[PDB]
Structure formats: C-alpha cells, structure tokens
Amino acid sequence: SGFRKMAFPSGKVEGCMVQVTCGTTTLNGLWLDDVVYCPRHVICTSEDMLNPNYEDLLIRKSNHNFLVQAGNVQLRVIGHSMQNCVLKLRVDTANPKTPKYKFVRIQPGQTFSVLACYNGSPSGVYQCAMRPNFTIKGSFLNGSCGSVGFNIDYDCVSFCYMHHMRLPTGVHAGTDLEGNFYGPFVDRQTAQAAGTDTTITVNVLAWLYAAVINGDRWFLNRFTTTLNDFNLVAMKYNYEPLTQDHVDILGPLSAQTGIAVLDMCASLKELLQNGMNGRTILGSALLEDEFTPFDVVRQCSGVT
Amino acid sequence: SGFRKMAFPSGKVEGCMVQVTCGTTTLNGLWLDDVVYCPRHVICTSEDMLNPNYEDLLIRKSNHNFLVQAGNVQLRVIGHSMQNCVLKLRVDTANPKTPKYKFVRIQPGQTFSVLACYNGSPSGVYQCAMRPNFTIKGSFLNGSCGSVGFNIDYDCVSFCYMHHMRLPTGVHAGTDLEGNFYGPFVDRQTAQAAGTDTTITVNVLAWLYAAVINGDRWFLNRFTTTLNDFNLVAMKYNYEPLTQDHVDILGPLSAQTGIAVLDMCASLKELLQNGMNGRTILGSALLEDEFTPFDVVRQCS
Ligand SMILES: *C(=O)[C@H](C[C@@H]1CCNC1=O)NC(=O)[C@H](CC1CCCCC1)NC(=O)c1cc2ccccc2[nH]1
Numbered sequence: 001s002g003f004r005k006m007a008f009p010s011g012k013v014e015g016c017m018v019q020v021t022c023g024t025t026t027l028n029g030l031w032l033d034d035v036v037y038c039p040r041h042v043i044c045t046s047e048d049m050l051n052p053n054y055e056d057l058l059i060r061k062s063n064h065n066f067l068v069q070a071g072n073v074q075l076r077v078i079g080h081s082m083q084n085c086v087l088k089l090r091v092d093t094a095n096p097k098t099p100k101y102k103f104v105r106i107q108p109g110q111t112f113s114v115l116a117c118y119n120g121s122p123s124g125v126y127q128c129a130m131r132p133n134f135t136i137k138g139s140f141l142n143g144s145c146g147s148v149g150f151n152i153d154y155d156c157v158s159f160c161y162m163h164h165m166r167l168p169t170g171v172h173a174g175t176d177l178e179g180n181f182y183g184p185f186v187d188r189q190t191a192q193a194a195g196t197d198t199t200i201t202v203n204v205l206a207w208l209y210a211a212v213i214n215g216d217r218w219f220l221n222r223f224t225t226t227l228n229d230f231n232l233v234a235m236k237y238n239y240e241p242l243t244q245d246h247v248d249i250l251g252p253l254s255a256q257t258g259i260a261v262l263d264m265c266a267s268l269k270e271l272l273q274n275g276m277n278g279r280t281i282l283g284s285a286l287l288e289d290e291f292t293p294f295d296v297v298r299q300c301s302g303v304t
Numbered sequence: 305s306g307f308r309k310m311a312f313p314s315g316k317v318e319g320c321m322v323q324v325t326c327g328t329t330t331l332n333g334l335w336l337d338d339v340v341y342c343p344r345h346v347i348c349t350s351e352d353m354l355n356p357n358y359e360d361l362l363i364r365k366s367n368h369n370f371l372v373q374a375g376n377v378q379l380r381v382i383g384h385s386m387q388n389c390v391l392k393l394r395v396d397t398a399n400p401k402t403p404k405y406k407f408v409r410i411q412p413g414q415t416f417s418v419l420a421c422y423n424g425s426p427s428g429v430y431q432c433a434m435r436p437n438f439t440i441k442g443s444f445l446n447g448s449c450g451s452v453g454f455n456i457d458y459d460c461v462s463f464c465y466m467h468h469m470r471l472p473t474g475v476h477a478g479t480d481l482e483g484n485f486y487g488p489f490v491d492r493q494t495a496q497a498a499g500t501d502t503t504i505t506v507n508v509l510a511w512l513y514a515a516v517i518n519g520d521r522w523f524l525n526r527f528t529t530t531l532n533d534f535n536l537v538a539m540k541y542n543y544e545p546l547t548q549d550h551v552d553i554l555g556p557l558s559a560q561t562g563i564a565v566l567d568m569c570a571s572l573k574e575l576l577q578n579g580m581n582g583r584t585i586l587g588s589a590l591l592e593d594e595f596t597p598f599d600v601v602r603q604c605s
C-alpha cells in the first residue's frame with residue numbers, strides 16, 4: 001500500500017473558485033449556484049482593520065463596489081448580504097460547474113483538503129487537520145483568503161473551511177461556510193492567542209494501525225492497558241483524552257490488524273515514555289496525528 | 305506562510321482519467337485527444353505475468369478486447385499500439401476536457417503530484433519525488449495502475465509518471481508517458497531489487513531554506529564549508545553529492561534568506577553529525593528531501 005498525506009481530488013472545487021475585489025483588496029471567492037461566498041474582511045480598508053464594524057462597512061457598499069471575476073468573465077453582483085463572517089454576493093449567473101455540495105462544520109481532530117487559491121486561481125492542494133485549539137497548520141500567502149477546505153463523499157463536496165487569517169504564531173484561523181469562526185477568533189487585526197495545542201490521540205492510534213497495515217511493527221508490544229490507565233499517561237504528554245467513541249471508531253482498523261485498541265494504546269504509551277530511539281514509523285520520526293481513522297481506512301482500502 | 309507537502313490542483317487531470325478493461329484486468333487510462341494511455345501489462349493473464357512477451361500478447365488482441373469507459377460512457381477503441389511499456393488505444397472521440405499537456409521525463413530528485421485512481425475514478429492527490437534509485441514512495445492499492453504523476457505550469461500539465469507496479473520493499477515503479485520505465489525495472493512478475501536509495505541533498509537544503517523562511521532557524525551555525533568538504537561528509541550519511549549546479553539552483557533561496565548555500569551546507573553537515581536531538585524543523589523530526597528548490601519558492605512565494 002504505502003502511506004502519504006493524501007488530499008481529495010480538487011477538480012470539483014477549482015470549478016467554483018472566483019476572484020472577488022472590493023476597493024484595493026482582492027481575495028478568493030466560492031461560487032455555488034448564483035452566490036459567491038468570500039470573507040467579509042474584503043470590505044475592510046487598512047484604516048479599518050483594527051476594529052471594524054462590518055454592518056457599518058457593508059451598509060456603505062453598493063453592488064458595484066464588488067468586482068467578481070470567474071477567470072476572465074466578470075460576474076455582475078445583483079445583491080449582497082452578510083452571514084456572520086462571510087459575505088454572500090448574489091450574482092446574475094449560476095455557476096455551471098456547481099457540484100453537489102453541502103456546508104458542514106467539522107470537529108477538532110478531523111481532516112480536510114485545502115485548495116489554496118490566489119486571484120481566484122487554484123495553486124495547490126494539501127491535507128489539513130482542525131487542531132484541538134481550532135487552528136489549522138496551513139500553507140497560505142497574501143491573497144489566499146477565501147480559499148476553502150473540503151472533504152468529498154462520492155459526488156458531494158462538503159465545504160468545511162474558509163480561510164480568513166494567519167495567527168501570529170503562523171497557524172491559521174478561518175470559518176465554516178456559514179461564517180462562524182472555528183475557535184474563539186474574530187475578524188479584527190487584534191492580538192489573538194491560539195490556546196495551547198494538544199495531540200489528537202485517536203489519530204495517532206489510527207496512524208499506528210496504518211503502520212501495522214503497512215508492515216512497520218517494531219513499536220508493538222505484548223502489553224495491554226485500560227482506557228483510564230492510558231488516559232492518565234496521555235494527559236502527561238499533552239495528548240487529547242481517548243473516549244470509548246474513539247475506541248469504537250478504531251474498530252475497523254483493529255479488526256483488519258488483529259491488534260486490540262487497548263493493545264495499540266499500550267504501544268503508544270511506551271512510545272510516549274520511551275520515544276522512538278531514532279527509529280521511524282511510516283517514514284516519520286514523530287507520532288503523526290493528522291490522519292483520522294477514516295483517512296487511514298480510505299488510503300488503505302482504495303475508496304473513490 | 306506555513307509549509308505543507310502540497311500537490312498541484314488535480315482537476316485538469318481528473319478530466320482525462322478513464323477505466324480500461326482488458327479481459328479480467330481493470331486499470332486506469334489517461335485520455336488525451338483521441339488516445340488512451342495505460343500500462344501494457346493490462347493485456348497480461350495471471351499465468352503470463354512471470355515472463356510475458358508483450359509483442360505476442362498484443363498481436364493476439366483485437367480492438368474489441370479493450371473496454372474503455374469514460375464515466376459511464378463507453379469509448380470505442382479504433383486502434384491500438386504499444387510504445388514500450390504503455391499501450392496506446394486510439395478511440396473514436398477526442399477528450400473534450402483534454403488540457404494543454406506535454407509528456408516529460410523527470411530526473412531523480414524532482415517531485416510531482418500523483419492522482420491515485422481506481423476504476424478510472426480519481427480517489428486522492430499527493431506529492432511524490434522520483435527517488436535516486438528511480439523508485440517512488442507512493443500510496444497505491446490494487447487497481448492503481450494507469451494512475452499518473454504530473455506537474456502543472458501555467459495551464460500546461462506535464463505528465464511525467466504512470467503507475468505500473470509495487471516492488472517487494474513496498475516502493476513503486478513506473479514509466480513516463482512514452483512507456484520507458486524509470487530505473488532498471490521491467491513489467492514482469494519477477495524479483496527486482498531497487499538499488500540503495502539515498503537522500504536528495506539539494507532538496508534537503510531547499511527545505512532548510514523553507515524552514516528559515518518560515519522562522520525555524522535553531523539549526524543554523526556560524527560555520528562555513530567548501531562543496532568538496534561537505535561532500536566528504538555527505539557520502540558518509542548516504543546523501544547525494546552536491547554540485548555547483550545544485551548550488552546555483554539554490555541561489556534564489558540563498559538570496560531571499562541571506563544565507564550562503566555553503567553556509568546552509570555547514571548547518572546540514574552538523575545536523576548529520578549531531579542529529580536533531582528531539583528538535584523539529586517545519587513539523588518534521590526528519591530531514592525532508594521531497595521538496596525541490598522550485599517547490600519551496602512556489603510555496604514560500
Ligand atoms: C487573506 O488573504 C489573508 C490571509 C493571511 C495572509 C498571509 N498569510 C494568511 O493566512 N488575510 C489577512 O491578511 C488578514 C486580513 C485581516 C483583515 C481584517 C480582519 C482580520 C483579517 N490579516 C491577518 O491574517 C494578520 C494580520 C496580522 C498582523 C500581525 C500579526 C499577525 C497577523 N495576521
């Protein structure tokens with residue numbers, strides 16, 4: 001099999017990216033049917049970013065203040081409104097490339113693909129996880145705002161993320177497609193701290209299963225443990241609590257490998273207390289936590 | 305900025321992927337214009353896998369033995385031929401979604417995106433490098449063959465890889481779109497040893513520049529070294545030799561950081577001799593070698 005950070009194919013999403021300009025600022029927009037979704041901070045001027053009032057700022061705009069370009073074709077804005085931190089720009093043309101889609105809000109620990117965009121043009125795709133502190137470790141440069149994160153279920157594109165800003169620590173913060181920030185962040189250029197991050201334990205375990213599925217077994221041991229005994233050690237290493245739901249989600253991986261979840265927990269416990277001693281798992285010398293159980297299954301099962 | 309294993313957006317290639325069925329074997333094809341490209345071992349029976357004579361196998365086939373499906377639309381094969389290890393199926397319909405494309409053969413150390421596909425249907429995109437041993441550390445499962453590796457410049461897709469097989473060590477082998485295998489491998493179910501893989505030094509240095517550009521500088525040192533001095537140490541750690549060309553290719557990154565290439569080499573040499581010692585660079589506890597200088601400049605600019 002082999003194991004790689006694998007994103008969803010980005011084709012269905014590249015067909016929705018447009019460029020949105022308001023005044024001097026240009027950022028990406030998401031064009032679904034006759035609505036373009038973009039960060040509401042496009043309506044902000046540099047003399048306004050420290051504490052904008054977006055209702056004030058949006059009342060002073062007309063439709064002709066928004067230039068929306070789909071490639072070379074300019075879309076005429078017919079209406080606009082604000083839903084939380086996203087601006088919705090109603091345009092006179094529905095997107096012929098609109099895929100089956102939904103807006104979903106993901107949970108910390110969950111992964112998604114990010115189609116990084118500039119001037120409405122897709123430039124790269126990578127896999128991300130919503131960190132426990134509700135930040136993402138993305139790769140974004142100036143102009144990336146409005147790039148979206150998404151998962152694909154068969155033909156359905158589940159948009160879960162729109163990029164708004166970079167925190168001073170260099171991680172990234174954004175909203176779901178309903179404009180609601182992940183985590184306690186606000187769209188103001190103010191001091192904003194991401195809380196302390198933690199390791200997504202269930203994903204480390206999923207990744208350890210993927211290692212066994214792929215023949216890296218050196219870290220396995222004859223020992224088991226209880227959930228509660230494992231979680232006592234997990235807390236010391238800044239690892240998220242492991243719940244019975246996590247154990248139950250790891251079942252299919254447990255079944256394919258014949259290794260009990262609590263047995264894998266005892267292996268992780270020993271990895272944490274002893275380290276890898278310079279050894280590698282799946283080509284990494286640290287415990288990877290940005291693979292969910294479903295990620296592992298799909299890459300080890302061939303889902304299309 | 306942030307740093308991530310980033311692949312090219314894959315839509316332009318998704319529009320070219322098809323299912324190719326010959327007998328009992330189903331794998332993926334690349335449909336550009338009126339031609340469908342796929343691995344030739346699609347014509348192999350399980351019995352003929354150990355020692356196939358593809359010229360014999362293809363002579364005994366007709367156009368109607370090749371079932372090409374684009375979505376649920378069946379494509380009619382009008383002609384077939386073999387160019388080395390790839391089969392070229394002429395179909396009666398030119399792909400409407402055909403991008404601007406070229407076929408290119410990449411060098412060791414260069415990277416590309418892989419659109420893993422099953423039954424013609426794109427399932428995932430990831431970044432790869434052509435290792436020095438001409439193998440790729442891929443993620444593929446049964447039905448992956450025909451999956452293509454590619455780079456996108458402007459609107460042009462440069463196809464550089466087509467998936468053919470997994471070596472017993474679990475790395476992967478394949479050909480360019482002209483059917484020439486990368487490395488000394490052949491499409492026969494025989495014992496085939498990939499050579500000793502080595503680390504792509506020029507890419508490790510590029511990634512160390514990415515790291516500096518992203519504020520990770522703990523590994524930097526006041527020391528400098530000559531290319532020949534560095535190479536004496538590189539050899540001992542299974543690292544590729546570094547050339548003045550590599551030095552020159554790393555110029556842009558050296559410029560944007562103000563760190564001389566041979567200064568960064570002095571950092572790498574110390575990282576090799578002492579190790580990271582529990583420290584991390586760009587979220588990695590390993591020196592990463594799958595980012596070319598161009599990858600780094602594109603992601604960091
Ligand atoms: C959108 O295109 C960019 C995305 C940033 C740019 C660089 N890397 C990214 O992820 N968004 C911004 O630049 C925001 C714009 C603000 C407008 C007003 C509402 C909040 C967002 N600014 C930042 O992301 C930003 C400014 C800043 C200053 C000092 C430290 C950190 C910091 N982050």
Ligand SMILES: O=C[C@H](C[C@@H]1CCNC1=O)NC(=O)[C@H](CC1CCCCC1)NC(=O)c1cc2ccccc2[nH]1
Pocket residue numbers: 001331345348353444445446447448449450467468469470471472476490491492493
């Ligand atoms: O879809 C095509 C697959 C891709 C494989 C499948 C699993 N992971 C991959 O990358 N190719 C294959 O399955 C090809 C089949 C083809 C037949 C004719 C001669 C050339 C090879 N076979 C192989 O890769 C293979 C690996 C291997 C390891 C040990 C012993 C025999 C082996 N065979």
